């Protein structure tokens, strides 16, 4: 009872991530430390500096702090000057305490003053309909959005002076576009902070052909994307069968898309809500169901799988 | 247009409030000011001083701030004393902008933005099952909970050295008992902030004979109390009658208590689930609906009110 878990996450874990914030808290792999709840920060940095390949002056800790809009992002440590604070206190009594560990490769890490801000750059690609992590960036707050564009272009492997559209990933389901690039970061972003995320893409008529042209639309898609498991009632011990749907979808839409997978009519399907989580089918869905898929999967606990049972109907008696 | 509403609410409006936070947002009375969005704060203080009838030195503004934890509380003024800062800037574009106004007699003590905290004091009376506003206090953060107990007794009209059980009203349906009284304020409370509320009661076995022995039970009970209005779907304008229920109630309970009010059997009543966002009934509601009344009504807004239709039948 006198120890705590400190979890370290490193920037490579942010690569390939396709959702909101930097990584998926469940699926990411952490580097873990048992630490005395009365430990010193310098004492932890020492242990960390030996365990990892990096010296103390080539690393920087950004504790992963939750925010009031439901986001969890790298934040600034509240050390600075005469602190002498204890680990468990620095964590505000959180245990485990997760921390983003900034290092360098392949030299010394820059200095960070507060008139500076750390930002995270993501590049949305409407062709592939995927996000591409482009690292992070120290910059004075006084700097103007236009002055970052070369670094976004470069990091996304674009030619210089490629025309880009910039959004701020604010929270899940809110991606505000940055309108005027000729203002400073504090004015350009909604509420400037060190975890803030600019997503960017090419301004190009060629990406109107794609399923989701703008980043803003992409995040709206992810927000509603949900993967449901379809099991046949007449076949007991059936695993499924997994389909990707929206909360938004109504009965016809759910029906026609499951039908385009089972290779049958949507009129020959008979679904059953529901179980959260007293597993097993229940009331059969009338095909005039006025609700939507969000309503059908309402009773499920958050970290549980979504199962809906179905039945194939006869086409001749 | 280039004008914003600024609603002042005075500490007299917190008295008798029987729920979470300081006042009922709907039922409270405001003094309303219409101000240029570009005004100085100085100008507002001048006109507020003129209107309300207090000198600028006897007043203090605590803008009300709606939180994502489900509470609205007084907050420290933002002004970086006071680099321009227009009123609409100070409100984060919020229109209207509500502000708790602190006066004095019917002078005001200095408050260190960095080292002092303003806390609110409620007293729960388990006998009557009622909350009693006991005002607000300025205290150092370093100060220990132990040292506020005398003040809590005084304001509730208790004798000194009266035993008290302390809670923090964190948010609706969350009232955390304070265990150690010999720690600082910042240690004792969850996230110390101006506008934090601690509720206290006598430590007396007598009140265990109450239907709701503690504040914890009281607020939990309040979270569940919910009013819903029932109307006949066939086919008038709206013969509305609203009856008090719990959020914990399942189908049987809600039916048996609405059927009893109409005089019929529950088997005669057919509830239709509220379409939600859309206009009318639509769906019929199954009598084997395994959910609660909380689940039936989570479509309805926070305004709100709560209502759902029925044939009878």
């Amino acid at each position: 009872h006198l120890y705590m878990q400190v979890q370290i996450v490193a920037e490579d874990q942010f690569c390939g991530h396709q959702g909101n914030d930097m990584y998926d808290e469940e699926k990411v792999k952490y580097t873990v430390f048992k630490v005395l709840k009365n430990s010193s920060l310098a004492e932890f940095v020492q242990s960390l500096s030996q365990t990892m390949g990096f010296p103390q002056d080539q690393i920087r800790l950004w504790p992963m702090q939750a925010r009031s809009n439901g986001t969890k992002r790298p934040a600034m440590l509240d050390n600075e000057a005469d602190g002498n604070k204890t680990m468990i206190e620095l964590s505000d009594n959180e245990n485990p305490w997760t921390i983003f560990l900034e290092t360098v490769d392949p030299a010394t890490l820059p200095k960070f003053d507060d008139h500076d801000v750390m930002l995270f750059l993501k590049m949305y690609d409407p062709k592939t309909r995927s996000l591409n992590y482009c690292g992070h960036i120290y910059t004075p707050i006084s700097c103007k959005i236009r002055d970052l564009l070369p670094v976004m272009c470069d990091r996304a492997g674009f030619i210089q002076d490629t025309s880009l559209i910039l959004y701020e990933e604010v929270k899940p389901n809110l991606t505000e576009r940055i309108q005027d690039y000729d203002v400073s970061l504090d004015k350009a972003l909604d509420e400037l902070m060190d975890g803030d995320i600019i997503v960017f893409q090419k301004d190009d008529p060629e990406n109107d052909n794609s399923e989701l042209p703008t980043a803003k639309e992409y995040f709206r898609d992810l927000y509603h994307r949900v993967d449901v498991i379809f099991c046949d009632k007449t076949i007991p011990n059936d695993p499924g069968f997994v389909v990707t749907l929206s909360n938004r979808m109504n009965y016809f839409q759910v029906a026609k898309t499951v039908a385009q997978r089972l290779n049958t009519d949507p009129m020959l399907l008979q679904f059953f809500k529901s179980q959260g989580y007293r597993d097993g089918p229940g009331n059969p869905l009338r095909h005039n169901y006025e609700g939507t898929l969000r309503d059908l999967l309402q009773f499920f606990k958050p970290r549980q799988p979504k199962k809906l049972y179905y039945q194939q109907l006869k086409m001749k008696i | 247009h280039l004008y914003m509403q600024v609603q002042i609410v005075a500490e007299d409006q917190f008295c008798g409030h029987q729920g979470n936070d300081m006042y009922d947002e709907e039922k409270v009375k405001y003094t309303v000011f219409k101000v240029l969005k570009n005004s100085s704060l100085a100008e507002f203080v001048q006109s507020l001083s003129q209107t309300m009838g207090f000198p600028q030195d006897q007043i203090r503004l605590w803008p009300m701030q709606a939180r994502s934890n489900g509470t609205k509380r007084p907050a420290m003024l933002d002004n970086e004393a006071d680099g321009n800062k227009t009123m609409i800037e100070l409100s984060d574009n919020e229109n209207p902008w509500t502000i708790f106004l602190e006066t004095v007699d019917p002078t005001l003590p200095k408050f260190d933005k960095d080292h002092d905290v303003m806390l609110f004091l409620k007293m729960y009376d388990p006998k009557t099952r009622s909350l009693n506003y006991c005002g607000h206090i300025y205290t150092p953060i370093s100060c220990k909970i132990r040292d506020l107990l005398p003040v809590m007794c005084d304001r509730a009209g208790f004798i000194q050295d009266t035993s008290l059980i302390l809670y923090e009203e964190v948010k609706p349906n969350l009232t955390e008992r304070i265990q150690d009284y010999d720690v600082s304020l910042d240690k004792a409370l969850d996230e110390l902030m101006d506008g934090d509320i601690i509720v206290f009661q006598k430590d007396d076995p007598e009140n265990d004979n109450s239907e709701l022995p503690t504040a914890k039970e009281y607020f939990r009970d309040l979270y569940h109390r919910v009013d819903v209005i029932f109307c006949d779907k066939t086919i008038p304008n709206d013969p509305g009658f609203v009856v008090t229920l719990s959020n914990r109630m399942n189908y049987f309970q809600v039916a048996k208590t609405v059927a009893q009010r109409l005089n019929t059997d529950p088997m005669l009543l057919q509830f239709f689930k509220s379409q939600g966002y859309r206009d009318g009934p639509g769906n019929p509601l199954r009598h084997n609906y395994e959910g609660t009344l909380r689940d039936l009504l989570q479509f309805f807004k926070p305004r709100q009110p709560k209502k759902l239709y029925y044939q009878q039948l």
Binding site: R67, S68, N69, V117, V170, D186, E191 | S68
Partner: peptide, 9 residues
Amino acid sequence: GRKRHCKTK
């Protein structure tokens, strides 16, 4: 031009 401490929406 400084940064904020907490988010608000």
